[PDB]
Amino acid sequence: SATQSKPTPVKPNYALKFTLAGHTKAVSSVKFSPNGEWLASSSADKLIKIWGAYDGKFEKTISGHKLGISDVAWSSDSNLLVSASDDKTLKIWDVSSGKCLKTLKGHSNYVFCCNFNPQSNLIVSGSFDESVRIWDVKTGKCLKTLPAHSDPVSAVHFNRDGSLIVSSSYDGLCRIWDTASGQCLKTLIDDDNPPVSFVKFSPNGKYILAATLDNTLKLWDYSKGKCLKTYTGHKNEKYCIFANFSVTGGKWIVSGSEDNLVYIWNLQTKEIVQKLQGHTDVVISTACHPTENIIASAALENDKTIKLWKSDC
Numbered sequence: 015s016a017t018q019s020k021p022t023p024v025k026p027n028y029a030l031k032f033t034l035a036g037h038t039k040a041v042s043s044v045k046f047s048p049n050g051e052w053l054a055s056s057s058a059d060k061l062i063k064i065w066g067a068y069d070g071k072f073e074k075t076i077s078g079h080k081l082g083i084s085d086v087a088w089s090s091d092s093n094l095l096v097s098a099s100d101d102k103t104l105k106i107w108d109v110s111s112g113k114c115l116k117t118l119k120g121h122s123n124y125v126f127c128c129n130f131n132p133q134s135n136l137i138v139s140g141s142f143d144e145s146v147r148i149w150d151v152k153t154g155k156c157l158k159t160l161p162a163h164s165d166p167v168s169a170v171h172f173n174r175d176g177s178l179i180v181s182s183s184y185d186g187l188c189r190i191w192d193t194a195s196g197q198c199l200k201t202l203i204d205d206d207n208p209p210v211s212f213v214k215f216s217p218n219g220k221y222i223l224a225a226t227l228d229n230t231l232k233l234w235d236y237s238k239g240k241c242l243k244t245y246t247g248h249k250n251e252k253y254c255i256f257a258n259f260s261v262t263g264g265k266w267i268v269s270g271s272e273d274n275l276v277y278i279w280n281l282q283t284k285e286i287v288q289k290l291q292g293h294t295d296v297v298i299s300t301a302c303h304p305t306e307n308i309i310a311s312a313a314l315e316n317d318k319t320i321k322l323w324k325s326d327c
């Protein structure tokens with residue numbers, strides 16, 4: 015109908031619904047399962063915990079790492095997790111049984127970041143050892159070691175068909191890699207060169223969102239090599255804080271912050287539309303539910319909790 019219209023944009027109204035207690039040290043990452051049913055958390059306490067995505071109810075603890083965990087990530091079918099640990103390994107877990115399927119050995123220092131590719135036949139990892147590794151999920155063996163950076167690797171992420179990996183480092187660089195060959199296709203340069211603390215592809219793989227330790231998030235068109243948007247106002251000078259695209263309602267950028275708040279920006283206008291108060295330490299990780307307007311946030315060791323926030327839009 016000619017009267018069909020685009021709705022007037024409405025600011026979100028995320029409100030605290032649940033606080034998820036159980037970790038005994040800083041939480042390091044939270045991620046919603048692709049099927050929307052579960053939230054996984056990792057912690058410096060060496061544990062992974064699974065919680066109901068909608069009701070926040072504790073489901074199970076997954077144990078096995080010998081030291082703290084920095085990151086955890088889901089396979090596309092929501093059946094597997096991979097975790098990255100200070101014990102220098104990654105582990106692949108069967109979520110239903112809680113059992114460790116494979117231990118991925120090869121990094122020579124702390125593993126800081128990890129992700130499955132969309133096909134979920136590969137895992138990519140990044141380490142304090144300055145390398146990015148690509149692993150075969152089935153065999154649990156390392157396929158490629160990329161001499162990716164000259165300082166610790168803060169983030170690694172596949173694009174939507176797994177043909178590219180983006181990595182970031184404290185060396186100040188973002189790099190795009192051809193998954194199949196391991197060859198570097200592009201390097202992003204900042205002449206001021208602040209450490210890059212996080213990077214990920216946009217949900218359509220057209221852009222990359224990168225955090226630098228000067229309180230700044232940037233949306234880059236990596237094919238044109240130009241910055242489209244900048245998001246500021248939060249505090250990020252020390253930690254590798256995740257950022258997200260929220261796409262279930264209004265299109266937002268979401269990030270934790272060193273002032274204990276969750277920041278939500280309008281993706282287009284770059285204005286802060288909400289700040290979520292409640293955590294009592296640095297919000298190191300946030301995640302956005304794949305279908306409902308729900309955010310998970312996780313905080314460092316003065317807090318140790320995960321919070322679930324829900325919005326009407």
Ligand SMILES: CC(=O)[C@@H](C#N)c1ccc(Cl)cc1
Pocket residue numbers: 216217218221259261265
């Ligand atoms: C379903 C969506 O909104 C997304 C897709 N695909 C999306 C969101 C934000 C950006 Cl910048 C790109 C793409």
